[PDB]
């Protein structure tokens, strides 16, 4: 199995695998189940801003998303990366759709990491059809309108169920390393989750993977395509 | 008085004002005396390298100061700089002799803040004789070897006692801003501290103050370059 | 006098001093007189952006002024800057209006300058009411719409005539030091010009000139914020 | 064939395929035969910085080498990058010796390229035994003294003649992007160059291919590891 280190921003509660009874975005250790959360009013069609940022001083990794209109959510974990990640990793986006669904759409993504120094940066304000610096996975999908969805689309515009896409930066990235003095990571990116459903599914997630990293098998839905299980 | 958000690098311990009985990093605000410090065992004569890291989102402040031999010391603080900085800052770096003296070369200082996006950068990896970025007071003094030199030293590299110095970048530096996402800062500079005294100090510090400050009358010891009392 | 380095973008035609017969963007040389211009379409009540490159092996300086649509303008000149400008400058943003008017809204301002490494930089992508590292100079104004208002506008949203105003950045800058091997700037700004006028004036400059450079008196029309003269 | 833009830092006159009859750096557009030279005293054991320039606006693309010392060569050619490469590359660097030979030792490498904004960065001031952001090619190789050796070296730190090595980039690159309004790379590394030897050979590259480029076969010494041949 993979290793994961997400920030999800879950859209749907699934209060029988530990999501909080609300929307929230949530540090994820190697599980689904977040070690951390926090409510957070995903707001429908408006487009909103995830930044996550960790360093291996302060050894809290952080996630905000916040709205144009300054609605805000925090979650702050203490953790030691470096005892979970291995020293390669894969940057990436993700997002899935269950038996609800939305669209799950990143209008940018920029990622820095630094080991100080080496440090790698890259910035996504649009994307393009063949984007050969990300490479996708499952549903999802680049071009032409510059932007990332992540899952399936249709056509007409429409967000469509048991889809799970994801994308990684080519790099590898150098996350950690035993001689660094500080080893830090901050990911931005801009997503529109607009719904139509009677409820919003499943959210969309930052994460940092061993570098060969690749879907779990039905991890659509609340294991947004990071985990195999809800374990 | 100045409002003062600082890192030192306290290398004599003045153990009846705070200091633990050893040198230590400290995160000081508003008071010298630290909030929290580490054991820092300063090695004469190295560079070593301060890294300071502070975002909105983790609200730590963190500093880890290493040697090219790799002795790290790491101290952290949960605190919010919105309640305590004003939203304008002038930074800087601090050093102060007193009984006891050392070299307080600064051989590199770089400085990013962040409202997330308005930014700030700024690196000197090597100073002028004349520097019109920096606010120089007290007994600092740069170039041309490349170096700011904090603290007085005389003809033959001798530091000098009771000395006290300081360079403050120019621009003012927006630091926070209460509509702002992420306000992050971090700040790095290497720093080659020197003494053949019977104990080195009082040691450096990088600080954050009010547009205006400036050097406190008699805080040339233990006071570092920013307290005009141990309260 | 100022020296003066700047990119102009010059809304109107005055072809007694220069100007081609058309608005342009130039580099102008210690002289309103562009050293070279391109035919630039000023597009009425269109955000653009201007970008201004240079570094000290190549030699060449090029600005390019593009907006939403995609029509460029881009001028290049070669020319060693070690050679104009005065070893520390303050960079800067200059709008005038004359007998004809318009907006001279600037609603971003980055910029990068190096010696390779010391280095500036910072970006404006929202200004504030009260901007502590902005030296504003004649009618330019900031805030709270995150903007930089150049050149005067009345409470209903109209451009003001015989306007001229500037805000450099506060801090010195430094964008040559002859023991370096690159020394290179590049500027971004992005401003949103209107006129209901007959033929909109006079335009906005990207200007590099001595620290302490202010408007010259009468500098208001065609002489952008920049010379005292057409000479 | 590969497609090729290199900057060359070239030891060994070959005179009987365009070389002048100097060690020199070169601009290398598609042929090893350089369409600008400049002469450039290698400084034998000393370690030298590269620095590329390149953007779409000024359309120059620069190159300096320096030494500690401050001696310095600059080549200049005027060439729009958009029509000689594709828009998606890997950029690297390549080292050959011949019959006569040296160390290419890289001991950092940065690189930023930039559509204005898509962006990508990295700096290597280090490599790694399983440097896995790097695809190493030929004789090339990273670790454990944090360097890189693009030709093979010799148990006891000795030249082997006939050795090509190759490091680039894990990501393809997106160098140009057809509605870019500035397409922007700059390369820096540092290389030590250190012969015993009669004469040095041949010297390091900069370059940028198309994303599957590798060596050419027998493009050891004077062909650098670029092009099949001398054409
Ligand atoms: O922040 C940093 C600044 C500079 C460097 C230096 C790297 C380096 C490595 C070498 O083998 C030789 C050398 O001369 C320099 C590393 C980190
Ligand atoms: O320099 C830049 C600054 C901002 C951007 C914006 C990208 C973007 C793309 C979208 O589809 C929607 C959106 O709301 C924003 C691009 C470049
Ligand atoms: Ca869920
Ligand atoms: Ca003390
Ligand atoms: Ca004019
Ligand atoms: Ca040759
Ligand atoms: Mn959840
Ligand atoms: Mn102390
Ligand atoms: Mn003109
Ligand atoms: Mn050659």
């Known amino acids: 199995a993979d290793t994961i280190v997400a920030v999800e921003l879950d859209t749907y509660p699934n209060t029988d695998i530990g999501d909080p009874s609300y929307p929230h975005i949530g540090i994820d250790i ?37 709205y144009p209109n300054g609605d805000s959510a925090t979650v702050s974990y203490d953790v030691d990366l470096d005892n979970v990640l291995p020293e390669w990793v894969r940057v990436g986006l993700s997002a899935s759709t269950g038996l609800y669904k939305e ?8 990622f820095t990491s630094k080991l100080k120094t080496n440090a790698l940066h890259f910035v ?46 080519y790099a590898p990235v150098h996350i950690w390393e035993s001689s660094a003095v500080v080893a ?29 990293s690749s879907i779990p098998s039905g991890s659509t839905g609340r294991l947004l395509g990071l985990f195999p299980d809800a374990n």
Do not use: C
């Open 124 to 169: 996504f304000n649009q994307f393009s059809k063949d984007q050969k610096d990300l490479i996708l996975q499952g549903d999802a999908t680049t071009g032409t309108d510059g932007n990332l969805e992540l899952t399936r689309v249709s056509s007409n515009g429409s967000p469509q169920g048991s889809s799970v896409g994801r994308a990684l930066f």
């Open 103 to 110: 669209t799950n759409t990143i209008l940018s993504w920029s």
């Open 30 to 66: 190697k599980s689904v189940r977040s070690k951390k959360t926090a409510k957070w009013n995903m707001q429908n069609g408006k487009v909103g801003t995830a930044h996550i940022i960790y360093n291996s001083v302060g050894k809290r990794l952080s996630a905000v998303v916040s």
């Open 184 to 212: 830090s990571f901050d990911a931005t990116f801009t997503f529109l989750i607009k719904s139509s459903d009677s409820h919003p599914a499943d959210g969309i997630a930052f994460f940092i993977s061993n570098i060969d």
